[PDB]
């Protein structure tokens, strides 16, 4: 039931809802996308195949030449991840595409070619993703963060009644493709349709209809319905449809067949319509004035002479009726207009349309798109055809086509990627329908309208950009006269494609530096959705509606975890169970509720399918078989939520965690925290520095193991077996017989990362958590990364905390810390820094790395060897020389007093300048690693030769002692095989080992297995040989340094930073704080047993901030530590194993109807003792996110120990011995050490380097820069009367060149007086204004 890695320390689960779906692989959003990118797909759908098939074949200008694509393959990377992180290059694989050049024969449409030439051409290198979803690009690990952008398709927004005085809603449509132009439609306050392309100047919407080869009669046929009048020899009777009369009031008598229906001044009521339908009236007699405003439909010309009586779209009148009366026309077609249901918008737009033909419309479009040049007919036609109807310059998508068809209620989901006439007509018709009153405007914040790009999609887009860049040159090259018997390699330049891919991966907004100070930081950086980037909104132009949390974020995007600041709501984080659709839309799992039972089958529903069903809640009780135990349950149907009967529900939530991300699901008692405090705690939990010793969370959630294993910090066993050898840097697992392939010798070797630096200069270190001769199984952890304890995530330490005010040392948010916390090195962290010393080639000569530095004594050069580089293990403080470098310089040209001094003392000058590398001031570490890189033309000093000898020895030793282990395992396998089927008890050890693999057996597959083992051993020997030669040739080879630099020396210092006042600590509930004092042990408040508290926190921070989760975490930590203390007392008295069994089972049987039955009676009396030894520092407790432990269970746990159920104890004062007048809340809370250390914040300056144009001090602490005394501080000094302080701020301290030297000399001469002068920035301003045409001057 329980795994061997989890029988060591079982966390007591207080959750009560049984889980149905286990948490998926967390980094599966980064790994699936790039897998789709670089994958041989037989259909040209995903990745490089799609790009190659969408660009190739490249055909010349009908020159009987064609370059066509065959296949591709990714080569082997030159260096693996570690080598390219050390050297400083990209981890990538060479892309090698196989092409084929074919030359046709003249006078043939598709005739037989005359020659073929199939060649494989190399085009660029594409970076490769590591096992964890990161990219090594220039030695640094980067993460390509996903993007949340608007899906392609047609979106019918509105105007909400603003932007106009009358308050009219101006409905608009917009067609957004993946690649192409924007075909926006809209309305003006006069209800005339308009169209604008690429957000340019506005044009009438009928211009595009005419440009699509439509007449006026055809347009009126499309967008209107006819009213057939007729000349029945008198009165102009018309055909009548009763539905046309709805919402009308006729001033006359509507009388048909001599029957009165609607009287004078009577509105045509619904009863009147029903009466007309019942009588089946299809023809009526209307007054002659009824056509006084009706718009005709078509062109009616004279029968006699052919003259134009009335053109299409012109309102008829009495004279026009007379002119069409005796002409010979009897059928008159008029448009159906109205004011409420069928508005005449197209007719009015036609009446505003300036053009009257297709060519006029095309010319007007050309003048709008490209103003200022004379338009040709063919140029305008080409522009219009290349706007939206060309496969190259326009592509909607597959997603765009699907959304386009869904929005227009079509039945097909696939089709052409370019627009057609039908698409534009349908968009216009639906916009007009929305204007009429039927139809709803879309919301652009719905998660059914927003889509997720990832690494594979964006990389494919950039690769396609590079491909079209190279196809331009290939098409130019084939048509350039030459025939030419050339190969398919002289036309392709690999620099455009590789340049595009390098531009994307290295210099992009979504390709950012990885956050590597936690497993949680990496995991939550890879699962990050960003609304910014290339193709999305900016931090300044973003409004309030994209920042808000939509009802469709439920289960797909975390509501709380988002950065607070300029981009809040733009950098959202993916939820726990959320997935991505086939098209890119977020979806979340729900389990189907059949007729009456909640089944276990799970369906993934996107944000549009979710609205149709009514989805129950995870906090719903089931009666052990599926039925809802209540008679009506609470569910959310369409955004809104209310109570529904149990016979109406369709789906149920999988879990209570599915609404929050993986960073906000690590906060115990989240439901008691305020949302602002929960946001702050989620955002601060990933700044925690990994300390010297990961402890564990004593009050956790159960999400710790998932975060620690699904990241890449631990070492997880690939196959089961028995640990054969453990070491500080290696674990060897002897795989089980049933998990081994028939050929190989089954042993797994795990090499551990030891003391490397992360991106944030912290320390990365894996230490084994298994012991020698210990069974492991698949999935068990073998080593713990940074912030991991036995496979669980452990961000900080849990310490005894009292909530009381203590003499003002925890005043606002400050923290009072005991001295035991700093004595025990609980918050001591190791920081590793890289320092480089580049030796370049100057004009006066090269720079050397000699240890013979001028002007320094023998005391400073004591830590340097003969080669001028510091020793390994040397403890260097600030100012100590690490690498001694001297640069040549010219002639000093010293002053008369200086040369008199030289003449008196006879000490000649030095021609070289001391430019040595030295430790930065303030830091004090130990040199743990020195790396020397040398250009391949320069002699190597003795230190580089020693480093090379060490590296070659280590490479040979590692390969030798991996081959020894593999050979030993293979021979043990052979010996075990020889025991059965040809048994040899002691007839085996006399002959040499090499003869064990060439012995015969029966005519079965056992001889084939012995021979397979022998072949494997021979392959291992030759593999060792070839790997050794490769390693030697790779170690001895030179380096590809930058142009100019001769050699680089890098020194790594490890600094152990203890805790101190000013360091920022926090908890998981948004309770940050800067510690203020390190109190002695005897000054801390202590309870009845003399045990002092470790941290004293202010009780005043709790009521105003409503983060009540920390109080309950304190009480539950106290209960857990009480159980641990009881177990520890039973273990110190070495009572018995039955007593331990009884108490641990009683502790695991709490509380009220929980899951996680443990059944401690199946343990083996030695697994009980390991468990009890792991539970003697406190029993870990799992409190799920919204399931949790009720406070009654906390009281029961407190009773189970011997603690008071109040959670508060009588506390004494360490300095006076007098008890505090009230009981105070003592307990254990899990504290974190955020990465805001005070020795990285403190800065001070008096005089340093000044800037170049404006002679002012530089920026802070990187170049020893001053503090900006900005405009608001100037206002503050003007609000006082401080006129002299201000004047020295802006003249002598900053900018006046003569005055600052004079002031320095005055200060060192004991005179405090200023001679201000005028700043240099004002002179710069005068020169810059004067270098315009303007003459500004100072006059007196």
């Amino acid at each position: 039931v329980y795994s061997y890695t989890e029988k060591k320390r079982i966390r007591k689960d207080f959750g009560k809802r049984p889980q149905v779906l286990d948490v998926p692989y967390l980094l599966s959003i980064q790994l699936d996308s790039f897998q789709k990118f670089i994958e041989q797909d037989p259909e040209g759908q995903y990745g490089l195949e799609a790009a190659f098939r969408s660009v190739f074949p490249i055909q010349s200008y009908s020159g009987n030449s064609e370059l066509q694509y065959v296949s591709y393959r990714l080569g082997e990377p030159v260096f693996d991840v570690q080598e390219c992180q050390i050297r400083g290059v990209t981890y990538s694989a060479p892309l090698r595409v196989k092409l084929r050049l074919v030359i046709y024969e003249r006078e043939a449409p598709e005739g037989t070619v005359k020659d073929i030439k199939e060649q494989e051409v190399y085009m660029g290198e594409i970076p490769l993703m590591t096992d964890n979803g990161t990219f090594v690009i220039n030695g640094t690990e980067r993460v390509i963060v996903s993007q949340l952008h608007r899906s392609p398709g047609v979106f019918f927004d509105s105007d909400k009644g603003k932007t106009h005085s009358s308050g009219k809603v101006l409905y608009n449509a917009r067609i957004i493709p993946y690649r192409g132009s924007w075909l926006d439609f809209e309305f003006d306050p006069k209800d005339n349709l308009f169209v604008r392309i690429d957000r340019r100047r506005k044009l009438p919407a009928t211009i595009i209809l005419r440009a699509l080869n439509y007449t006026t009669e055809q347009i009126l046929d499309l967008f209107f319905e006819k009213v057939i009048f007729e000349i029945r020899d008198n009165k102009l009777q018309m055909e009548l449809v009763p539905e046309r009369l709805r919402g009308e009031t006729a001033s006359f008598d509507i009388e048909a067949n001599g029957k009165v229906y609607v009287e004078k001044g009577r509105r045509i009521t619904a009863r009147h319509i029903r009466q007309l339908e019942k009588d089946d009236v299809k023809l009526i007699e209307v007054p002659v004035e009824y056509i006084a405003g009706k718009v005709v439909a078509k062109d009616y010309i004279d029968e006699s002479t052919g003259e134009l009586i009335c053109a299409a779209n012109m309102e008829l009148s009495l004279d026009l009726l007379a002119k069409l009366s005796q002409s010979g026309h009897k059928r008159i077609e008029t448009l159906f207009t109205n004011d409420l249901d069928h508005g005449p918008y197209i007719s009015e737009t036609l009446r505003v349309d300036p053009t009257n033909d297709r060519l006029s419309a095309l010319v007007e479009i050309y003048r709008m798109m490209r103003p200022g040049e004379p338009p040709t007919r063919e140029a305008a036609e080409s522009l219009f055809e290349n706007l939206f109807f060309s496969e190259d310059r326009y592509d909607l998508s597959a997603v765009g086509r699907m959304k386009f068809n869904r929005s227009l209620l079509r039945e097909e989901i696939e089709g052409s990627g370019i627009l057609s006439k039908d698409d534009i007509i349908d968009v216009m018709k639906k916009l007009i329908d929305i204007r009429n009153g039927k139809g709803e405007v879309d919301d652009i914040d719905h998660l059914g309208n927003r889509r997720i790009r990832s690494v594979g999609e964006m990389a494919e887009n950039q690769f396609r950009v590079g491909l079209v860049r190279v196809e331009r040159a290939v098409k130019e090259r084939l048509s350039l006269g030459d025939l030419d018997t050339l190969m398919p390699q002289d036309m392709i330049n690999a620099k455009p494609i590789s340049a595009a891919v390098k531009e994307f991966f290295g210099s992009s907004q979504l390709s950012q530096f990885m956050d590597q100070n936690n497993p949680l930081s990496e995991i939550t950086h890879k699962r990050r959705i960003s609304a910014l980037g290339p193709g999305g909104l900016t931090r300044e132009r973003a409004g309030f509606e994209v920042r808000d949390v939509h009802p469709t974020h439920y289960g797909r995007v975390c509501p709380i975890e988002t950065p607070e600041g300029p981009n809040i709501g733009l950098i959202n984080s993916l939820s726990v169970y959320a997935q991505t659709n086939e098209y890119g839309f977020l979806e979340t799992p729900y389990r189907k509720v059949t007729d009456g039972v909640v089944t276990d089958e799970i369906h993934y529903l996107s944000a549009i399918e979710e609205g149709n069903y009514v989805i129950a809640q995870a906090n719903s009780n089931l009666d052990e078989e599926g039925h809802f135990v209540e008679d009506l349950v609470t569910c959310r149907s369409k955004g809104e939520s209310s109570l529904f009967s149990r016979d109406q529900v369709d789906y149920m939530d999988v879990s209570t965690q599915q609404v929050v991300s993986v960073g906000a699901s690590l906060i115990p008692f989240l439901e008691h925290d305020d949302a602002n405090r929960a946001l702050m705690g989620a955002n601060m939990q990933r700044q925690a520095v990994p300390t010297l010793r990961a402890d564990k969370p004593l009050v956790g959630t159960g999400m710790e193991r998932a975060v620690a294993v699904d990241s890449g910090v631990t070492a997880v066993a690939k196959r089961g077996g028995v640990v054969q050898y453990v070491d500080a840097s290696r674990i060897v697992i002897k795989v089980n017989e049933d998990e081994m392939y028939p050929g190989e010798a089954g042993i797994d070797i795990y090499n551990l990362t030891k003391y490397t630096r992360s991106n944030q200069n912290t320390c990365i270190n894996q230490m084994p958590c298994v012991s020698l001769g210990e069974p492991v199984e698949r999935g068990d952890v073998l080593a713990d990364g940074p912030s991991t304890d036995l496979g669980e995530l452990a961000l900080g330490q849990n310490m005894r905390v009292a909530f009381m005010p203590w003499n003002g040392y925890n005043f606002e948010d400050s923290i009072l810390v005991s001295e035991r916390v700093v004595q025990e090195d609980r918050f001591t962290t190791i920081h590793i820094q890289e320092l480089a010393c580049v030796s370049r080639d100057t004009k006066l000569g090269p720079e050397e790395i000699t240890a013979d530095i001028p002007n320094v004594g023998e005391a400073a050069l004591s830590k340097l060897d003969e080669s001028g580089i510091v020793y390994i293990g040397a403890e260097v403080t600030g100012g100590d020389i690490l690498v001694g470098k001297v640069t040549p310089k010219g002639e000093t040209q010293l002053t008369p007093e200086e040369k008199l001094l030289r003449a008196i003392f006879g000490e000649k000058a030095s021609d070289v300048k001391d430019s040595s590398l030295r430790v930065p001031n303030g830091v004090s570490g130990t040199v743990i690693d020195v790396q020397v890189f040398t250009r391949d033309g320069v002699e190597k000093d003795k230190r580089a030769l020693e480093i090379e000898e060490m590296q070659l020895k280590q490479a040979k030793k590692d390969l030798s002692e991996e081959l020894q282990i593999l050979e030993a395992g293979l021979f043990s396998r052979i010996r075990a095989v020889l025991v059965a089927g040809g048994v040899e008890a002691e007839k085996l050890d006399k002959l040499p080992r090499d003869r064990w693999l060439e012995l015969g057996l029966t005519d079965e597959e056992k001889q084939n297995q012995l021979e397979q083992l022998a072949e494997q051993y021979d392959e291992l020997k030759h593999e060792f040989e070839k790997k050794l030669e490769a390693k030697r040739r790779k170690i001895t080879q030179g380096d590809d340094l930058a142009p100019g630099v001769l050699k680089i020396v890098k020194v790594y210092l490890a600094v152990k930073r203890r805790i101190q006042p000013g360091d920022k600590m926090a908890g998981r509930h948004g309770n940050k704080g800067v510690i203020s004092k390190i109190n002695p042990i005897e000054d801390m408040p202590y309870d009845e047993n003399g045990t002092p508290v470790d941290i004293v926190l202010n009780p005043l921070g709790v009521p105003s901030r409503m983060n009540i989760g920390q109080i309950l975490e304190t009480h539950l930590g106290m209960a857990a530590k009480g159980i641990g203390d009881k177990i520890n007392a039973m273990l110190k008295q070495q009572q018995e194993v039955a007593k331990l069994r009884e108490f641990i089972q009683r502790a695991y049987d709490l509380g009220a109807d929980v899951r996680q039955k443990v059944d401690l009676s199946t343990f083996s009396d030695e697994e009980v003792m390991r468990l009890a030894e792991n539970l003697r520092k406190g029993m870990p407790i799992a409190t799920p996110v919204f399931d949790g432990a009720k406070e009654a269970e906390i009281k029961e746990l407190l009773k189970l120990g011997d603690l008071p159920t109040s959670g508060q104890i009588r506390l004494y004062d360490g300095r006076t011995g007098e008890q505090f007048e009230r009981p105070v809340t003592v307990g254990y809370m899990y504290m974190l050490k955020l990465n805001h250390l005070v020795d990285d914040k403190m800065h001070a300056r008096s005089t340093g380097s000044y800037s170049l144009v404006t002679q002012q001090p530089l920026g802070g602490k990187a170049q020893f820069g001053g503090q900006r005394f900005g405009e608001m501080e100037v206002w503050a000094l003007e609000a006082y009367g401080a006129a002299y302080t201000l004047q020295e701020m802006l003249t002598v301290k900053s900018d006046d060149v003569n005055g600052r030297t004079k002031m320095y000399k005055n200060i060192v001469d004991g005179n405090h007086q200023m001679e201000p002068g005028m700043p240099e920035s004002f002179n710069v301003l005068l020169k810059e204004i004067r270098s315009l045409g303007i003459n500004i001057e100072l006059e007196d």
Partner: peptide, 14 residues
């Protein structure tokens, strides 16, 4: 066409 655009290359082409 005079004068719609600034575009000193378009004016040269014109």
């Amino acid at each position: 066409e005079i004068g719609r655009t600034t575009d000193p290359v378009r004016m040269y082409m014109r």
